[PDB]
Structure formats: structure tokens, C-alpha cells
Design a protein around this nucleic acid. Sequence first.
RNA 1: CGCGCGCUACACUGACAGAGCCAGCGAGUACUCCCUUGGCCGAGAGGCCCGGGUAAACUCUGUCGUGCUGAGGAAUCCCUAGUAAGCGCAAGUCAUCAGCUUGCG
Lengths: 80, 94, 88, 235, 126, 50, 49, 186
Amino acid sequence: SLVSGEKTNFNHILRLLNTNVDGKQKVVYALTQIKGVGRRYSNLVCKKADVDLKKRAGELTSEELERLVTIIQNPLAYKI
Amino acid sequence: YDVLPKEVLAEVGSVKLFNRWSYDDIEIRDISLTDYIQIRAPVYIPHSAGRYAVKRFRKANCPIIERLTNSLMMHGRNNGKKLMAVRIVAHAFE
Amino acid sequence: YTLLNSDEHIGIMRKMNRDISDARPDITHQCLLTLLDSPINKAGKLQIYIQTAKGVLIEVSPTVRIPRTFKRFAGLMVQLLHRLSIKG
Amino acid sequence: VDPDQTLKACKALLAHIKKTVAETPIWLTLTTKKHIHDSHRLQPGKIILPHPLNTSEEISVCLITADPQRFYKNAVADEFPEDLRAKIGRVIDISHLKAKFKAYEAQRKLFSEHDVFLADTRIINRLPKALGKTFYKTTTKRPIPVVLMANANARPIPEIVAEIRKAIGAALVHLSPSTNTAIKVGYANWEPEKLAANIETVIRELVERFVPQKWQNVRNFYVKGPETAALPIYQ
Amino acid sequence: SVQAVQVFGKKKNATAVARCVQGKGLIKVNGKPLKLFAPEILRAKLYEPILILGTDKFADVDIRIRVAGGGHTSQVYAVRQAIAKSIVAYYAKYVDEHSKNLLKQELIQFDRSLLVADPRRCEPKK
Amino acid sequence: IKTYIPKFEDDFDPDKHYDPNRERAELAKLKAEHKRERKGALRELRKDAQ
Amino acid sequence: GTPWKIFKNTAFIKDMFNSSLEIAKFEGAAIRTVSGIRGQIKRALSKPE
Amino acid sequence: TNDLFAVTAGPRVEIFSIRKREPLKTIGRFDSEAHCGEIRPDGRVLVAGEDTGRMQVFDVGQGTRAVILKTWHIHKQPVWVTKWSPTELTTLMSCSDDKTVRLWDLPSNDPTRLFTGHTDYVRCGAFMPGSANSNLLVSGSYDETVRVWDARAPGGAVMTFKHADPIEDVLPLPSGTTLLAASGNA
RNA sequence: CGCGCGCUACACUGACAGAGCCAGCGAGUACUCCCUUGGCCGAGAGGCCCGGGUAAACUCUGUCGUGCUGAGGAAUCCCUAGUAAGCGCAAGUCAUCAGCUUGCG
């Protein structure tokens, strides 16, 4: 009568750099919602940060969320 | 067998539409349309190049799935395509 | 370019002797005002079409709020009849 | 020919270019004194440089094989993950190239997609009429020979990957029936000592491999930039 | 000395040569098998003469077909015409006329276009 | 229902283009007048040639 | 002038006029090749002026 | 004989193979959750109810196929189990989060029968296997009650058993006579 | 300025990546899209080199999912079987036609 619901609160709106609305869609379809970010650009961001395309937005830990917000500031520091 | 896949050699017994569906026990419920819904001559796929628009009431002889396919290819952008329509009929029957 | 009403065209239609009472867009304006302010429109269960004498059939979206004044309504109706659509 | 003249000339030339920001190729213009007639001498070659021409940070190779494309694609899926699978985006047989890519827009999209190209020596005879003129004649992005030659008659796969590693950064050599040619040695963001080393080994390999009746047929090699003047190295 | 029958098949601009000889039971079209050569939905148009006649008639023959011209649909109709006419002509020449007549009757009872190609002329309502 | 405002010009006529930027409207007007004058000149020159 | 594209009979001729106004003036004119082939100016061409 | 079994974990189900034991397909059409991934006794059609209340039924082939046949959004509150009938191919049952278990048929857009009577969350249920037990349903709830219904008379439960614990699991025995209700520490 | 005739754009009939598979008419020692920054050999005119501006369709398998990323009013006209409609490839025939024409599948 006690099973951990530590993951079951995921379908809520996440906040990010510019957009205050970013819900669960996927990991690469959630990156398109930020303005200036493209559909071919969003796949390059995910292959560097060792995040899987299978996961959603909201299935990421408080460490793994911010790793995509540093690398969206400087695309030159991580090679491109 | 000459050259036949396993599904065809399995249903080698009778005439089956799309090699899966039989025509044996099919009853037309209305008495008036038994002449005009043609299930008497069985067909394998609805793509049959038959001249069913030569003269009057010749479309009362082509099989009813061919009628369904030829009426599925009905708008401005689905006009020429027949393999799309027989694929739609196959997927819809599945 | 203005709708043919009984305000200023009373002299033209009275001179050409053809039914001064027929050219009334004010009936359409007040009735469309009634239907857009009615709560069955605000609930969303109302769908409204207009048929004119020329054979023109206009769908009016429930999500529009019309100009309440007849001058702006007449200009909007002229633009609708000539451009076949009004974008928001 | 002494390389000190090449070193002082290329240093003066880099000063002339400068006085991202450069991003211009530097080449040397070969001249010969007699006409070129042998269609086997007209074959495109590669010269392996000691300092390789390509940066290899994000560039994508396209690899053009001849006979089964499924065999070569399975070899790409088989052999090497570190350097090769990040670069080899496409493996196209010549049959699939002549089938799928005949349109101007399609070959323009391929030319804009890939970064550098590699082909086999039994295909680069066919390639200027398979790939378009907008691919081939215009700029430097044009296929380099990789010898994939001994069910396709193929060299063994470690030698294949060794050849592709040698041929990614190699310098392409086209010869022409006329007497003047030009051959790229590097960019202007490079060091002039590396430049002079590249020019020296290119002079050695160009004469003693490609130009026939070698140092009889040689004429002046003038080091040139994109829009600047040429500096002489007689030969 | 060898038993060999060459039969043609025709549609709009798609033509098919089928050479039928004494064999083990294979059917090849352009050097590839019959279960390979077609669009994936028109193979049921190709297998129509085999399923009409049964496989026991095709147990003894080997048919080799070449096709040229037309589109996918015209080539499929040419292949099925060449198959049907080819086995009927082999049974005409090398086994009994009663078997030839039985095969012709079954094929004509299903679809006459397996044996006689009907071209589409231009004669609208004059 | 979230109602919206119908976008329309008050003094409407089919005889006039509507554009906010006078620069783009004036450039399109000059292109149209240049096309009209070029077509008139070509028609007069061709009839004089015949 | 100089031929630009050459079909069986109709050839497009480039380095002769500067504008479609000049061609419309010289419409129907008797043009000639150096070889002796006669011909007639038919129509101004739109896209290369 | 088939080589398919389905395991649902979180917002996706994953149809596994029996022989290869690999994830053969991963279906993540669901918005929020997927609470039981149950495939039909024919073996081509998977039903799964979400946390938003909808249940989606979709065809899977042997390979990567997820074509949606039907969707029902009548519960409007989560559905925890949705089970096929072992004999008929189109009849299925649903125990939702509110109070209801209910019988659906696949062609219809309406639940064919409705059964109420539970007072808490109902979260486990099954059909009754047997030649004589053609249409009987058992479901246990979180109100410490196991109820078995006849599907012919949609009134109350035919039989009811009250336990001491929130009833977590239910299975009937294949003879159709006895039944195991798993509630708490017993 | 007006009128039509063609052409183009306007999203579920979607986009991306692969795999496979189909035509017919077409061969005058004849055909080439510009114009230019530089340098070679050029007393001079030029020639070189390097930069800048056999189908479409169809079939099968995967990856993502409606997102200024909206198929045309009154009228008026045409059309009954290889016809309407989609698609490409080729030619340019003493009149007409490259802003297109006519064939061919």
C-alpha cells in the first residue's frame, strides 16, 4: 500500500529559458517550441547531452534539464 | 505448386478476396438488390480491367468490391490512382 | 460604395419607383445583433447563415462580434460582398 | 629547387593576404611546356599530404562504391565506429546515383548536404556525366579516388579503412589537356612552414608521378591565392 | 527433340514472351521468380491462371517470361496473359486435346482476357 | 466564446490597394504603371511596324 | 548578331539588339546568315532582354 | 502459439517477444499513463487504458504496427484494468477509477452494460472462465469487496465477499469454481 | 484600366530517410546559359587555369505529428470510355508557337 510515485508527476508545464510554456511532448519535439530553435537543430542538441530521444520532457532529473539550457546559450563551446 | 507463397498455397482451395476472405456464405438481405449486387462471379482483387461502361446495365455485372474501389477514387487528386484505392479497401477490410 | 438603404437612397428609389420598403439592411443588422448577443450564441449552440436577394449565402461565424453601428456595419458588409471573406 | 624560396614566398603571400577572416585556399599553378594527350594521364589522382587538408571536426564524407551497395553499407555498419561512422553519412552505388540523382535540384541538394566526397577509380570515369556540372565543374567539392579494388571484387576491409583514412585529407589532382593547371595546398589560416612542406611534397609527387617526361616537361610553378598575384618558383 | 512452346502476351504497350518447356515446375520473369516480379498487390493478378487451373497442371512445365514496355499494371496483365496462353498452348501440343479444351473452358469461364487480348479502339457513339 | 474583431477598412473601394507601408505600396504602383506603359509602347510600335 | 539556341529552323539570336522595343520596331525584318540562309525576325524574346 | 507478451510501465507499453525476449515494439501514443496492456486472445489487437480516462485499442502486427482502431473517452477519470473476454473476440470489460465496471463491444461507441455497487476505487477484475460461466464478471475494489456479477441482469452483484484489506489482485481458477482474492498480507 | 486563356502558390491526399521497380516518340561533322575578380603563356590580337553571382509516378519499410508551416461567391461555360482528371519525357518542321506550341507514353 506504498509504491513510490516519484515519477508519476510529469505531465505538467515546465519552464525554460524564454518560453514559460513547455509541457510533455517528447525530448526533441519539446525543443521546437522555443523560438529560434528548429526541427533539424533539436536533434543535434540531444546527441551531445547523452539524453535519449525515447524519453519525454518531464522524465528528466533537475540535473539533466539544465544541461540543455547551458548548451542552448553557447552552441560554439560544444563544438558544432 | 509452380511459384506460390505460403498464404496462397494455404488458401488454394477456393476463390478468396485478397487471399483471406471467402465468398461462400454471403447473403444479400434485400430481395431487390440480388440482381445488382454481383457476388456470383468471385474475384481475387478488385483491379480487373473490364469494360463495364460500354452500354446500359453492364455495371450490374462487375463485382461490388470493384464498384467500391472505383467510387473510392473520387475527387480531384485521387483520380488516376487505383492501387491506392485497392490498398484502402484491403486495409479497411482488415 | 455603401449598402442600399432607406437613409440616403430614399430619393433614388422613390424616383425609380421600386419598393422603398424593400432595401432595408437594418433588419439584417438588428437581427444579427440579437442573435450574436443571445446566450445560445455565447454557449455555442447557434449557427447563423444569411441569404440575400441576389442569391448570396453568407455563413457568419459564432466567434465574431459585429460592429454595433450601422455605418461600420455597412462598410463591413460591402467589404464582405466584394472580397468574399472577412479575416479577423 | 630549394624550399627556402618557397618558405619566403609563402610568408610574403600570407602577409599579402592578411594585409573566418581569411578562409581562402592557397594553391600553386603548375605550368608545363608541351600539350597533354594521354587519357590515362588525364585521370584524377590524389596526393597524400603530410599535413592533411581537411580539419575533420564535423565534415561528412560521401562514399561512392560500384557493385553491391548493400555489401558496402554492411561493411560501413561492420568495421569502425570512432572516425568513420560519424563521417560516412551515405554510401551510394553508381547505379543508385544514376537512378535517384538525375535532377538538377536533387544533385544540388546532395552537393549542399555533404562536405567532401570519395569515389572508386572505376567510377570517376563515369562520374562527371552522372553527377551534374553544378556538382563537378564549379568548385573543389568533387570526388577523390579511393581504390576499392581487389560478391564484389573488393580490397580487404582494414586496407579499405586505411585507404579512406589516407584519402579523406588528400589533395585532389586534376589534369587538363591544356598546359596550365592549379592544385590546392591549403588555406590561409595555416602556418607557412606547413604550407612550404605541402608545396614541396606536392612538387615532388606531381612531377615524378603525374607530369610525363617529367623534369623535361616541367615549366614554372607559381604560388597563388584566390584573387592575388602569383609568386614564382621556376622548375 | 525438346518440347518447347513460345507464346506472346499483349496489353497497351507491354509485351511478354513466355517460353514453356518440359521442366520441374519453375516460373521465372526476367530471370527473377514470379513471387518477386510485381507490385505487391498485383501478384494476385499474376497468380490467377495458376489458381484457376490448379498446380497439378503446372507441375510439369517450366515457363520463362520476358516483359518490356508499359507500366506496372500493363506488364502484370501481359504476364498473366502469357502464363495462361502458354500453358494452354503446351497442353495443345504435347498432351491431349481434351485437356486443352478443359483448360480453355476453365480460363474462358473465369476471364476471357487471359487468352484473347482485347485492344481498346476508338469508337464512341457515332 | 472568445469573440474576435473583424478586420476591415471603413471607406472601402475595389479600385484601390490597401497596404500599411507607403514604400511597398508605391513600389508596387510604380511597377504596375511601368508594365502598363511598356505594354502600350510595344503595342503602338508593333502596329506602326505592320 | 550571334545565334544563342538553335533548333531545326527557329534560332534564338542574341548579340544584335538591346531591348524588346527595338525588336518590336524590327519585327518581320529580313534577317540573313553569312552563309546565305534567309530568315525573318518573328518575335521578341522575354526573359533575356 | 504466438511470441508476443506485453509489459506496460509508465506512459508507454512495450510488446516483447517470447523467443527473443527483446522489446519488439514500444507504443507511446498515450498522453499520461497506460495501466494495463492486454492483447486479445487472437493476438493482433492491444487494449490499454490511460490515466486521463480514455482507453485506446489498437492493432499491432508481428512487427512495428500501432494503428489505432478505436478510442473511448467515457470514463472521464482513470481506467485501471481493461480485459478481453476469453471466448468472444469483441467483448471487453473495464474497471475504472471511480465506481464502475462496464462491458464494451468493439464495433459500438457505447458501453454495452454498466455495473455499479463499489464504494471506492475498483482496480482489479477478470472474466470467469468456464463452459457454464459464460457471462459472469468478478472485480475487487479498494473498498475491501469482491463482487461477481451476472451480465444478464445489470442490477447489483450476484455475490459479494467482504475482506479486511484493500483488494489488490483477483484471479479465478480455470475450473471456474474457486477464486483467489489477494488483499493485503493474505 | 477591363476581360478572359494559360502558369504558380494555397496540407492529410503530410514531411524526412531508405529499399525495389516500370515507357514511347527523339541522332544534319550538329548541340553549347550569362558576364566578370585574379593569374599563366601571350611584342600585339587570343587560348588556358582558379574563383563570384536512361522519367515522373508507383509499391514496400521505418522516424515525427495539424504547427500565415487553408481549394475560391453570384453567375457562366464545357464534358458520356482508354472520355474527364493526374503525371512526366521528347521535339520546335517555310504559316502560328518559347510568357509557349505540338507530339508521345
